[PDB]
Symmetry: D2
Subunit: 284 residues, 4 copies
């Protein structure tokens, strides 16, 4: 499996044409699963889920979707609340591809999008696996913005290699995962005019008047499916105290916390994450 071999495009309608890029693997496996990546600058499906797609594609039909504003998906200069925007894009893709009810796997911003989709289109979402998720997290103890969010904002204002490296170092427990090569690759993607347009567009929308759609901790008592919350104990972006309202209020919730793990569970605990996900989604 390569970036190129798995690369697919679809055109959907969200207030006009929207090109989505995604990766497909494990075609012919009985169970489809959709993967939604995190929202750090330069993030995309293939790099976010590199330690996971090959393994999950042994069990499932994997669709790893670049969210709008990321990777090779369209990078519009303006949009509404990001998770509802991305959920509308995903609904478009579900309809185009003829998907019925599909489990979703989402880290951080992608977890927010998975939840918004599961709330707005409840018949179309199956089991959820949510890693350090945004949206349904509310940091009952951590002052907002967190150290992690502050470093993301600093990059947005001053998009330098130094500021991107700083934000990446608070994503992980083992800072040796942040190699000069990773920093170089992410900075090249994050600093394009189009990517900076998408990060400028993103800025407005979470602070805009559409904000209530983002406060999904208010809504997840409505989720009827099993939901597996996965957290790194050392997550400095969406810290562990953000799990508590979702764990309490989602009837069929589970939580798994990994010690010695930051915000990139799917990378830092890739084997344990892969095994939890395979078992939770039914072994495929």
């Amino acid at each position: 499996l390569t970036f190129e071999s798995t690369s697919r495009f679809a055109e959907v309608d969200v207030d006009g044409p929207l090109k989505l890029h995604y990766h497909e693997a494990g075609v012919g496996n009985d169970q489809t699963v959709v993967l939604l990546h995190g929202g750090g600058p330069g993030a995309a499906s293939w790099t976010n889920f590199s330690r996971n797609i090959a393994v999950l594609a042994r069990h499932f039909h994997v669709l790893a979707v670049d969210q709008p504003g990321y990777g090779h998906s369209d990078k519009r200069a303006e949009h509404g609340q990001f998770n509802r925007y991305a959920a509308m894009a995903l609904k478009g893709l579900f309809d185009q591809l003829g998907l019925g009810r599909v489990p979703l796997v989402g880290n951080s911003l992608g977890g927010g999008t998975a939840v918004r989709f599961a709330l707005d289109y409840p018949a179309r979402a199956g089991r959820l696996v949510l890693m350090g998720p945004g949206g349904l997290s509310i940091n009952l103890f951590a002052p907002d913005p967190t150290e992690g969010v502050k470093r993301l904002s600093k990059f947005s204002v001053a998009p330098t290699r130094e500021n991107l490296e700083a934000f990446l170092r608070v994503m992980v427990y083992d800072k040796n995962l942040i190699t000069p090569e990773l920093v170089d690759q992410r900075f090249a993607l994050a600093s394009t005019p189009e990517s900076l347009t998408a990060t400028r567009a993103m800025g407005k929308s979470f602070a805009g008047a559409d904000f209530e759609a983002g406060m999904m901790w208010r809504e997840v008592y409505r989720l009827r499916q099993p939901v597996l919350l996965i957290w790194g104990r050392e997550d400095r972006v969406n810290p562990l105290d953000g799990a508590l309202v979702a764990l309490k209020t989602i009837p069929r919730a589970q939580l798994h916390v990994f010690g010695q793990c930051g915000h990139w569970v799917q990378v830092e605990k890739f084997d344990e994450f892969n095994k939890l996900t395979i078992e939770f989604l039914g072994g495929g």
Copy 2:
């Protein structure tokens, strides 16, 4: 596998002769694992771990040990802090059977004993799996004693079938697991003079001057092994807020919480519990 086929006795020395009863299965599997049951009146290894021993014995050499005061182990009228007493008994058994470093699985009181053993004899304890554990739990929000502990104390003072049924109903999320047959079986065992002697002996020791040995939330930062904390979200004996100091301070901690699950994780989520335990202890 039956109670009778797996039944074993050993005599160890803890301030004199002490007969321990245990169950053995999976002899010849490379990895030995020790199971330590919860401390509810009438509790013992076989009934506590009935949905687990057969499954774990496919992968591991299982030793399910009746703690002192329970099942067919000696029921002395007096002892020190219960977890250190039970840990000294287990050290005696480890030495008699020639065990080296062995993983421990413990629910509630048995989790306390596993931790006390791992702290006092660190070279002899491997990975720990601790379900709604006592000792290393400290209920940061729940007023003590909890609803669960109060019902246990009420039974001790007034050892009636009605008071035992009341305590068993706050052990589980699905109160239909508390059948008239379970109540009858547990009451027959719990109400013997010898069992009431052991429950009278137990009363003193947690309230005695030896109490600090029980406050294992103060000590678990010393544990060097991986530790899997497992909780029922609806545990009314040792509630979920009791997990937080251990999760923070044990370097290689993990936590798994099951929604729609009380204090008997190994019964109410037996399949998920079995799978977590098998994977965590290395697949055997």
Copy 3:
């Protein structure tokens, strides 16, 4: 100041004529404050606030309102979601008395009423003082229903003096406050057909299509006033973990917790409560 000297009646329109009983004191004082009592069987304004009304009336114009279903207020057999019902009645009284913007003090169910009032009629509510409040509390760790709520439910089904004393004992840290005289007085009021009809109607009103109106932890991020949350560390009805969403999300929140204090802060810590309330509402 006596029950009789302070006693007042109003008739307001709440889906038809509704008689409200209240106590008025400190008529000389410029700053009006409304007091809303707890919802335990046989509760009313004068008894709930017996250690507070005289002290507060030195500083403030006190209006202590018997909520619908309690004391000498109307006890309808049918009504909607209780806190919205009680808030509508209070709104009717505000309009009749020509009140503008007024601070509210409420314990438990009265705290829920104060919050519902402050959300539904935001310009009419000033500073809030809320003691072990319902509605904006969500018990992130404690399994629901709590020991306290279960004992209230048991009394509703089996309204005996024994079941009332059992509920009253889990409302305080110092059980000696639950005198035979207090139990006899509360039970004589609680056991009337009119009072029991109200108690059951209040219970049923929390479950139905509009249960969202009770989930005020979703809404209090919108409160613009200073809010003083006051909790007893040992509250077994609305435990301390219920404070966290409100403390995090109300911009001008404060929290005071008293150790060695249960669910009746205004009784158990009356002097500390009186001083906190006088200072917080501006000394009068």
Copy 4:
């Protein structure tokens, strides 16, 4: 009251002669209270408590002590665990001044010193008021080191005005409190060779064989006096989740949390802090 009019020196024996600087006020008043300042670079008694000493001196005989390594107290290059070192110095002063049992007020590192003093010399410590305290805090959710501690460590390695201003900005909610004048004054004191030597020595003293002396959350269950914990909801050095073990385990604990308040409660909420402290210590 001026810095100069209140200024006092003592020489105590702490593994050799130790000069202590302190401020004395309210010499007429019967109730003595000791104030212990925070440990940020360039901190001292008079500046830490500039909004408190005059108000408290109306009620109490105030002793505001420059802790070793700060202000005009000796700045040794070598010492043991800092809070035990500072507590031993305070004990020396207690004995010299003929003090019996005296209440202590301490923020952050000073709070840690107050607790270590109250544990090591239990008969000498009265009521405690502890604001965002170190030592008895354990951050159950926040990854350590916190944003605040990391900025202090960065200043220690690179003692620039820019790194001091960055640390000071995460100590308050209202960043306008960090005036150019305050930064210039704190940096001129912090940057001296004597002060930097002390700052580094204090940092190193928390890591070594006796690190247990810093883990005071293990020990405060033994405190018999009333303890008022005071926190800013937005404390980014010692965050609010650090309050929970102390609140649970100190029998006569109270907690006050201020919304829209960081790590300098005594400055940011000076009037509310002064009133809480005067009432809690018995009005004087």
